[PDB]
Amino acid sequence: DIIIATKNGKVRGMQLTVFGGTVTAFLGIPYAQPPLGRLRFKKPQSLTKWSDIWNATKYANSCCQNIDQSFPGFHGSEMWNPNTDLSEDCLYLNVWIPAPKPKNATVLIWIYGGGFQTGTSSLHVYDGKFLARVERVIVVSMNYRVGALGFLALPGNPEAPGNMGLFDQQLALQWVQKNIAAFGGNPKSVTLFGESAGAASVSLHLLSPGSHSLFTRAILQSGSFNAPWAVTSLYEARNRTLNLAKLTGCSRENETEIIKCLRNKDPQEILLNEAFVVPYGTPLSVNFGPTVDGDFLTDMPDILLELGQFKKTQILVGVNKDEGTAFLVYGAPGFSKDNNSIITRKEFQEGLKIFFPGVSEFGKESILFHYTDWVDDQRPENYREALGDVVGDYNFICPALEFTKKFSEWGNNAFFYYFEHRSSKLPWPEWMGVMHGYEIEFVFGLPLERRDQYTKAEEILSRSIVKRWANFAKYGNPQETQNQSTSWPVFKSTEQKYLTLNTESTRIMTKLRAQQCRFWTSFFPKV
Ligand SMILES: *[C@@H]1O[C@H](CO[C@@H]2O[C@@H](C)[C@@H](O)[C@@H](O)[C@@H]2O)[C@@H](O[C@@H]2O[C@H](CO)[C@@H](O)[C@H](O)[C@H]2NC(C)=O)[C@H](O)[C@H]1NC(C)=O
Ligand SMILES: *[C@@H]1O[C@H](CO[C@@H]2O[C@@H](C)[C@@H](O)[C@@H](O)[C@@H]2O)[C@@H](O[C@@H]2O[C@H](CO)[C@@H](O)[C@H](O)[C@H]2NC(C)=O)[C@H](O)[C@H]1NC(C)=O
Ligand SMILES: *[C@@H]1O[C@H](CO[C@@H]2O[C@@H](C)[C@@H](O)[C@@H](O)[C@@H]2O)[C@@H](O[C@@H]2O[C@H](CO)[C@@H](O)[C@H](O)[C@H]2NC(C)=O)[C@H](O)[C@H]1NC(C)=O
Ligand SMILES: CN(C[C@H]1CCN(Cc2ccccc2)C1)S(=O)(=O)c1ccc2ccccc2c1
Ligand SMILES: *[C@@H]1O[C@H](CO[C@@H]2O[C@@H](C)[C@@H](O)[C@@H](O)[C@@H]2O)[C@@H](O)[C@H](O)[C@H]1NC(C)=O
Ligand SMILES: CC(=O)N[C@H]1[C@H]([C@H](O)[C@H](O)CO)O[C@@](O)(C(=O)O)C[C@@H]1O
Ligand SMILES: *[C@@H]1O[C@H](CO)[C@@H](O)[C@H](O)[C@H]1NC(C)=O
Ligand SMILES: *[C@@H]1O[C@H](CO)[C@@H](O)[C@H](O)[C@H]1NC(C)=O
Ligand SMILES: [Cl-]
Ligand SMILES: [Cl-]
């Protein structure tokens, strides 16, 4: 029986057996008033103390969200879908502490991804008990609001000011600040990490002034705020908040009477209508997301980045080899997970229209021209592989690289990885490669469980990554020093060195996707 006194009351945890040892899990600790009723769309309000012993012995409700129902019964898709009841009452967090209770442990805070539209901390691949067990860190994860319910914006209007899901996250970091010492954690040694929209979130916390002092270091996996999907324009955010009001019959002249009306809709009505607030959706549409609210974000993040207006600290940043392939089977014609997806030139061109719907003919012609100068025009996988790189290079790799140059240019140490191992248990087809999101189980140390059908070389790779991530959190330096591991050099804007992560050989390489990212980061923004 392990009871910890938090500032808001006592919480009871449970005991786990991990690898012939013990982790104490506290699952589902509330960190805010439930954002219900008049509280829907407003910033999260602080929690009133309780007198009982709160029982933190199972994962809490996931936040309301639309579900990937594209591949029913397929583990490759459904593993990302919520594994707890959806509810608007979802502002809860989890804590894994090592046993015995540590003395002053480094804290890892996980922020999940999902396009700011989907996700939950209770997913199996976000289980923090292995990290607690193996590296003696405390792992914290939190649920934050998503979709319109977390990112609707009438900017300047406190009834729907925007960025609430980011303020959810921030209130969770604040909770760790006031309470993790009671769990044996060091509030002065808190490393944020997250993937995709989680990584975009971590990166905005580097920019937000109200987060500066709620963490120490940052890890960005497959995501950053400067990615083209990450920050909604304050124009579009208003156009989208208005389109939802018309779709639900809530159109009013007094913008506040609009919020009141949207607050008497059932969550299902708000959810079914989110996809239509944009005129041309894509598999990557962030219908409702981060915006420049004047509160969490004070200026356009590109400006802040360029002019050195962020928290000065170390960053670990990285991307996977085939970031784009996942999205191709969600709309791109000629694509399927259930065949090799050889597409034609004309099918490739049609794919650009799906992914670049508001881009000019010349801009689409320009993606085609820089990605279809073939070595061997006769290879039939040419066009299929070109469309995946187009989506991955544009949406993930090039902004992640451009974020790391810009950030390091202001003096801080930066470390960049290129994860190029395809999980031996991966359920998607092989042409899909080293997919978006399939480094996460390695970061969380799931291949360390021998019962889990991973190969031994995978257990070695996960163990090494877990050491590197924990040494970055503890010491700012993501080395593995005992076994004769490749030393991981700092990413400088001059030489641009990065580390490959694979089961075979860990190499140091230079200037990733250099020809591709010159197109994306210089030419393409002008179109
Ligand atoms: C909170 O938990 C206490 C302690 O019980 C523990 O947690 C439970 C979820 C279960 O797994 C138990 O086996 C654990 O030991 C609960 O205390 C029990 O309360 C009921 C009715 O109130 C009583 O009949 C039992 O004898 C109590 N003790 C045990 C060991 O069951 C308490 O009820 C829980 N409260 C809430 C709000 O969930
Ligand atoms: C800003 O919003 C208008 C209106 O959105 C339309 O109506 C909403 C209620 C919702 O159902 C959306 O899906 C609709 O698109 C947009 O105007 C539309 O633009 C498309 C082409 O871009 C056109 O075919 C529609 O007929 C237009 N509808 C109306 C009522 O004017 C407008 O494009 C949005 N602005 C941006 C920058 O996307
Ligand atoms: C690969 O599959 C796609 C998807 O089509 C569906 O899934 C298949 C696996 C099979 O079960 C079909 O019955 C389904 O239609 C194929 O794309 C379709 O292609 C046909 C003819 O080319 C076209 O009429 C449809 O519009 C396409 N549908 C979509 C959603 O794009 C594709 O042709 C297959 N290619 C190869 C090389 O296997
Ligand atoms: C509807 N979604 C997208 C579908 C395609 C991927 N599918 C989950 C998955 C993940 C990994 C491997 C296989 C399947 C869900 S989404 O999660 O809401 C979303 C929306 C916008 C985004 C913009 C940028 C980056 C990520 C984004 C995610
Ligand atoms: C490091 O490697 C271990 C197994 O290798 C053996 O033990 C190490 C400590 C060296 O003495 C080496 O000569 C041996 O061959 C793993 O058990 C251990 O988990 C690894 N650690 C990390 C962080 O990857
Ligand atoms: C998930 C949710 O929304 N509510 C509650 C669930 C379900 O309502 C019931 O199990 C019926 O499904 O049950 C609890 O009350 C329980 O007694 O364990 C906990 C939780 O708060
Ligand atoms: C924890 O570590 C910090 C330094 O990082 C130190 O100032 C603090 O006093 C320590 N507290 C405990 C309880 O060990
Ligand atoms: C909108 O309605 C609310 C509630 O009735 C009121 O407080 C606010 O002043 C109104 N604003 C305008 C511009 O009418
Ligand atoms: Cl050709
Ligand atoms: Cl060019």
Curated annotation (Swiss-Prot):
Annotated GO CC locations: blood microparticle; endoplasmic reticulum lumen; extracellular region; extracellular space; nuclear envelope lumen; plasma membrane
Binding site for tacrine: 80, 436
EC number(s) on file: 3.1.1.8
Catalytic residue list: 196, 323, 436
Main location: secreted
Catalytic activity: an acylcholine + H2O = a carboxylate + choline + H(+)
Family recorded in the similarity comment: Belongs to the type-B carboxylesterase/lipase family.
Complexes and interactors: Homotetramer; disulfide-linked. Dimer of dimers.
Disease: Butyrylcholinesterase deficiency: An autosomal recessive metabolic condition characterized by increased sensitivity to certain anesthetic drugs, including the muscle relaxants succinylcholine or mivacurium. BCHED results in slower hydrolysis of these drugs and, consequently, a prolonged neuromuscular block, leading to apnea. The duration of the prolonged apnea varies significantly depending on the extent of the enzyme deficiency.
The name this protein goes by in its record: Cholinesterase
Organism whose genome encodes this protein: Homo sapiens (Human)
